[PDB]
Structure 1
Amino acid sequence: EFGNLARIRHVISYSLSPFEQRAFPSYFSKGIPNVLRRTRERILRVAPPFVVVYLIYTWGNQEFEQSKRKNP
């Protein structure tokens, strides 16, 4: 509930009207580097398990296909 959540002192905040400012201010020119930075920060934690299970999926499919084949 608003008004009794925290004790804040010596903090000033400045804003604008939504009619006084652009909706998309420097969208691509500041969005492509920031998305690239977040990607650079998170690929080494996210991607390699998915790459490993991609190789597990492909290996399992080819091993199933080879076990289908009649051994001479």
Structure 2
Amino acid sequence: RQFGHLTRVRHLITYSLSPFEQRPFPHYFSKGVPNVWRRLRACILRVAPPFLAFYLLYTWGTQEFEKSKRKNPAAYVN
């Protein structure tokens, strides 16, 4: 598929300025950084969980394995 036969579009007016008449990385604070946060706090509660969960299991696992090696002070009290 090429250009000129994608869709039946009507009544949309767009306005844009040359790259040289504007700023590249504008308003890092006014709108920039906020949205970055507007995002970290939007998925953290959806992504983090299973990862955190994984972690606990990784730890439990390693710790347990590393315990089942050491001897029990009482396997021989005689």
Query: TM-score, with normalisation over the residues of structure 1?
Result: 0.92
Residue by residue over 1:37-65, the C-alpha shift from the partner in whole angstroms, topping out at 9 and shown as x without a partner, is: 11111111100000001000010011011
* Bigger fraction of residues in strand: 2
Aligned-pair CA distance for 1:28: 3.4
Q: For residue 29 of structure 2, what is the aligned residue in structure 1?
A: 28
User: Secondary structure in 2 aligned to 1:39?
Assistant: helix
Greater C-alpha Rg: 2
Gaps of 5+ in 2: 74-78
Residue 47 in 1 paired to residue 48 in 2?
yes
* Bigger fraction of residues in helix: 1
Q: Percent same amino acid at aligned positions? A: 74
Distance 1:24 1:51 in 2: 34
Residue 17 in 1 paired to residue 21 in 2?
no
Greater RCO, 1 or 2 (C-alpha within 8 Å, sep 6+): 2
User: Secondary structure in 2 aligned to 1:66?
Assistant: coil
Moved more, 22-31 or 39-48: 22-31
Number of residue pairs matched by the alignment:
72
Gaps of 5+ in 1: none
Query: TM-score, with normalisation over the residues of structure 2?
Result: 0.85
